């Protein structure tokens, strides 16, 4: 058995996502496929059961409109279409492989979830994408260290000296901001008798934005 | 009703250790309980079906039981190497869904504390003149994490937004933590010296610089 | 007290240079220097206020700094559309009364 698909782009409130994970190496027509998020911090919810025969799909006491499902014989690969997201979507979204058949509301009580894997992340944020204009960060054994800040989405990659180094490189955590940006912090240790004499920079990267900026860490003049 | 579970098992080595999941009359007991585990960062797995017997790709290693309103996951002793966080799962005719459980990761149970090292990043000239200053300061080599950062200006300490990050683990046996705090040029530009605490539960150590060089 | 300025300047394209607004003792570094430029047949704008901050709007191209008497001018590349006249404006206390130096004029050589 086989999961593995596409990360999902993030989606600002008041849109449309679809996620589909590959089925293959079986006949797609006997086992129903789930779907369920992992909150973090906290448990799972799950909003109903996909045959992948004829429409006998039901919808959870919770989930009304909002979620809508959609299957596809030709290629094997259920389809969804996800409305009204909101600050409680915010959960990475995971296909669940079931065994057996199940159409009526008590059968699947012998039913138990088969496979999981590599599912797709979906993030609830009225930012979509925007292009970073980050700034040199003047330092303070020594500390250095670049902070990113007015980007979206997570996460950017911090290397140094060209990507020479990669000892003492931790990607600090960030926060959810009220304008809705984010900043990872990285730094690295030099001795104090070099500080304003050796060159260094540090690499960030933008994957959506296609924006890679080779910026140089001055001292606060 | 809402199925619970403990936010955290403390489970020693050695010794074996289980775990509880409470539910009602018609969740538990009429339908049988799943248990499921997760590797950090991966998928999850299922551990325990229909109370009796288990997948093929776990050895003789896990037991789980059903009794009336709660079942038990008996486990026996514990690896240090293998931490993983447990799930628990039922069914309820009246939700008419699948319900999980909160999450229970098991703790290993004593280590003596460091000597925390403080920095504090001041902002560049090239932030200050698109208008605009931020102040950060970093907490590293400390163990354990559950550390609490505040800003504080040498007479009062100043609230414009202060957040404090959770801390996270890193592969050096080492906690990490950081705070950040974006401030204007005119207030930014009042206090000569600025600085951040940190909590080490027992160990509080300042770091001052000044905003000149 | 007079603010001293080349009447022209000589920037060739492709490397930075650097200009001078010189004055006089207690003239230049007791209060703030300020860089104005005017379009010819338009209203003036500001350049660098302070030598500290480069205000919006502006592109970061021009570098503002105070050396003692002498203020300089620091510029990254030369382009054909940042071609405007350059003019140095500054405070005295001695005067009462806003002093401006003679005009740099900057040509493509």
């Known amino acids: 058995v086989q999961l593995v698909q596409s990360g999902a782009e993030v989606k600002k409130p008041g849109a449309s996502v679809k996620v589909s994970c590959k089925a293959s190496?079986?006949?797609?027509?006997?086992?129903?496929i789930h779907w369920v998020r992992q909150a973090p911090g906290q448990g799972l919810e799950w909003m109903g059961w996909?045959?992948?025969?004829?429409?006998?799909?039901n919808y959870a006491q919770s989930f009304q409109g909002r979620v809508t499902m959609t299957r596809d014989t030709s290629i094997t690969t259920v389809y969804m279409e996800l409305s009204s997201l909101r600050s409680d979507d915010t959960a990475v979204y995971f296909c669940?492989?079931?065994?057996?058949?199940?159409?009526?509301?008590?059968?699947?009580?012998?039913?138990?979830?088969?496979?999981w894997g590599q599912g797709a992340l979906v993030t609830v944020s009225s930012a979509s994408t925007k292009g970073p204009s980050v700034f040199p960060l003047a330092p303070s054994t020594a500390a250095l260290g670049c902070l990113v800040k007015d980007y979206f989405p997570e996460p950017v990659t911090v290397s140094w000296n060209s990507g020479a180094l990669t000892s003492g490189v931790h990607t600090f955590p960030a926060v959810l901001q009220s304008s809705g940006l984010y900043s990872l912090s990285s730094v690295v240790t030099v001795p104090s008798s070099s500080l304003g004499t050796q060159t260094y920079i540090c690499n960030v990267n933008h994957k959506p934005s296609n924006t890679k900026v080779d910026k140089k860490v001055e001292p606060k003049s | 009703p809402v199925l619970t579970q403990p936010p955290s098992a403390s489970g020693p080595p050695g010794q074996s250790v289980s775990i509880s999941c409470s539910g009602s009359?018609?969740?538990?007991?009429?339908?049988?309980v799943y248990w499921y585990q997760q590797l950090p960062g991966a998928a999850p797995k299922l551990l325990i079906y229909?109370?009796?017997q288990r997948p093929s790709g776990v050895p003789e290693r896990f037991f789980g039981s059903k009794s009336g309103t709660s079942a038990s996951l008996a486990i026996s002793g514990l690896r240090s190497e293998d931490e993983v966080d447990y799930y628990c799962?039922?069914?309820?005719?009246?939700?008419?869904?699948?319900?999980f459980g909160a999450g229970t990761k098991v703790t290993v149970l004593g280590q003596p504390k460091a000597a925390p090292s403080v920095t504090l990043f001041p902002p560049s000239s090239e932030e200050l003149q698109a208008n605009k200053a931020t102040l950060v300061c970093l907490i590293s080599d400390f163990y354990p994490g559950a550390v609490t950062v505040a800003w504080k200006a040498d007479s009062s300490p100043v609230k414009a937004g202060v957040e404090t990050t959770t801390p996270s683990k890193q592969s050096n046996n080492k906690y990490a933590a950081s705070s950040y705090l974006s401030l204007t040029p005119e207030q930014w530009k009042s206090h000569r010296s600025y600085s951040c605490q940190v909590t080490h539960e027992g160990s509080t150590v300042e770091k001052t610089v000044a905003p000149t060089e | 007290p007079v603010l001293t300025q080349p009447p022209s300047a000589s920037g060739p394209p492709g490397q930075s240079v650097s200009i001078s607004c010189?004055?006089?003792?207690?003239?230049?570094?007791?209060?703030?220097?300020?860089?104005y430029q005017q379009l010819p047949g338009a209203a003036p704008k500001l350049?660098?206020?302070?030598?500290?901050?480069?205000?919006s709007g502006v592109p970061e191209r021009f570098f503002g700094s105070k050396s003692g008497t002498s203020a300089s001018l620091a510029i990254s590349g030369l382009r054909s559309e940042d071609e405007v006249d350059?003019?140095?404006?500054?405070?005295?206390?001695?005067?009462?009364?806003?002093?401006?130096?003679?005009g740099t004029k900057v040509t493509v050589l």
């Open positions: 229909k109370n009796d």
């Open positions: 669940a492989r079931s065994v057996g058949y199940c159409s009526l509301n008590s059968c699947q009580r012998w039913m138990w979830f088969d496979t």
């Open positions: 799962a039922a069914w309820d005719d009246s939700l008419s869904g699948h319900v």
């Open positions: 009359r018609s969740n538990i007991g009429t339908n049988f």
């Open positions: 996909i045959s992948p025969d004829s429409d006998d799909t």
């Open positions: 190496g079986y006949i797609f027509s006997d086992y129903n």
